[PDB]
Design a binder for this molecule. Structure first.
Ligand code: MN
Ligand code: MN
Ligand code: MN
Ligand code: NA
Length: 348
DNA sequence: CGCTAGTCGACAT
DNA sequence: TCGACTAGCG
């Protein structure tokens, strides 16, 4: 999550409606709808009580898309990424803390604060997502569980031309190189659209509107893969990259103390972290829904050795990747929880 | 002025 | 899954 990215490129956004993509294909970061839908029933998901309201919550959105002739491809998060294991551990810890806090508040009498702790201990399991998948398949809507992060999968779907837009709330999709991103979409169909090509409209970006430089900026600002340097945001990173008259990024990062004229100590492990973060944004494993195989988000360059890309996702057999993609195989238990077969009547 | 980290929100009666 | 708002510090 690139904090303050949306407001930073505000001049490259515009209010639209979904009808602009009428008759076209659009992929969806479904976990946002899952969270917002789970908020309405936080306490019941906290007590372990049976609840399927979030299903209907996502379904009114899906149906709203179907009403305007849109073809939605619901994309779901899959396995945990090693480049995000720290943030995941932290989030898990906070969810646990809030859960225990709320449960303690139930043993007193405070009902509001307990609900406030329960609405911040929301854990979107893969079973709920599977419920949403079943509900979507009952309506004939394509679904796809990403090998890891849904971000990279959406990015691939958008870059491959399989979809023409990405409905999400996360700003990372821009850093992954998505062409068209639809943000802040209500249940009525109104939202903001940020096109990559329009990134040149932002005067405060300068010449930093190319995919590579924009990615470097987003990384230097501070992402989930790598915490930024102390005192470095979007503006200073963009400033460095604008003053960066050098194709090699490493030397620039080593010269960040010069480009900003500040006292910045940069550890080697932070440089390695930047390389790993960049390679995470570039070559994270996604799933080709047509050829049915595990591929990186972008084709490997000649200046990169895929042997040292374990943090960007581990390769598995294409059959397993397909079973996970369909959602038939649970992410954790790695066991078959469903028996859906797309052949026996997205996947051409 | 820009960056940081904490608070607060998304639901919907 | 995330972002929006802001007091407080450089
Ligand atoms: Mn998760
Ligand atoms: Mn994501
Ligand atoms: Mn993300
Ligand atoms: Na930062």
């Amino acid at each position: 999550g690139i904090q303050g990215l949306l407001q930073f490129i505000k001049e490259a956004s515009e209010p639209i409606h979904v009808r602009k993509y009428k008759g076209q294909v659009v992929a969806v970061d479904t976990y946002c709808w899952l969270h917002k839908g789970a908020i309405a029933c936080a306490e019941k998901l906290a007590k372990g009580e049976p609840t399927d309201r979030y299903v209907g919550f996502c379904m009114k959105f899906v149906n709203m898309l179907l009403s305007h002739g849109i073809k939605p491809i619901l994309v779901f998060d899959g396995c945990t990424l090693p480049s995000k294991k720290e943030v995941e551990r932290s989030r898990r810890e906070r969810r646990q803390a809030n859960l225990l806090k709320g449960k303690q508040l139930l043993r007193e009498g405070k009902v509001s604060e307990a609900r406030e702790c329960f609405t911040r201990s929301i854990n979107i399991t893969h079973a709920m997502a599977h419920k949403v998948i079943k509900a979507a398949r009952s309506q004939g809507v394509d679904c796809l569980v990403a090998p890891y992060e849904a971000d990279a999968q959406l990015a691939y779907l958008n870059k491959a031309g399989i979809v023409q837009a990405i409905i999400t709330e996360d700003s990372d999709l821009l850093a992954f190189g998505c062409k068209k991103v639809i943000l802040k979409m209500d249940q009525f169909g109104n939202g903001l659209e940020i096109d990559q090509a329009r990134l040149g409209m932002c005067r405060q970006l300068g010449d930093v509107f190319t995919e590579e430089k924009f990615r470097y900026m987003c990384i230097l600002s501070g992402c989930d893969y790598l915490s930024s340097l102390r005192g470095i945001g979007l503006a200073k990173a963009c400033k460095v990259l604008r003053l960066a008259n050098n194709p090699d990024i490493v030397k620039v990062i080593k010269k960040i103390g010069h480009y900003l004229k500040m006292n910045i100590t940069v550890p080697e492990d932070y440089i390695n972290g930047f390389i790993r973060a960049n390679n995470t944004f570039l070559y994270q494993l996604v799933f080709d829904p047509i050829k049915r195989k595990l591929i990186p988000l972008n084709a490997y360059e000649d200046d990169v050795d895929p042997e040292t890309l374990s943090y960007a996702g581990q390769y598995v057999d294409d059959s397993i990747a397909l079973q996970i993609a369909l959602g038939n195989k649970d992410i954790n238990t790695f066991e078959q929880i469903d028996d859906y077969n797309p052949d026996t009547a997205l996947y051409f």
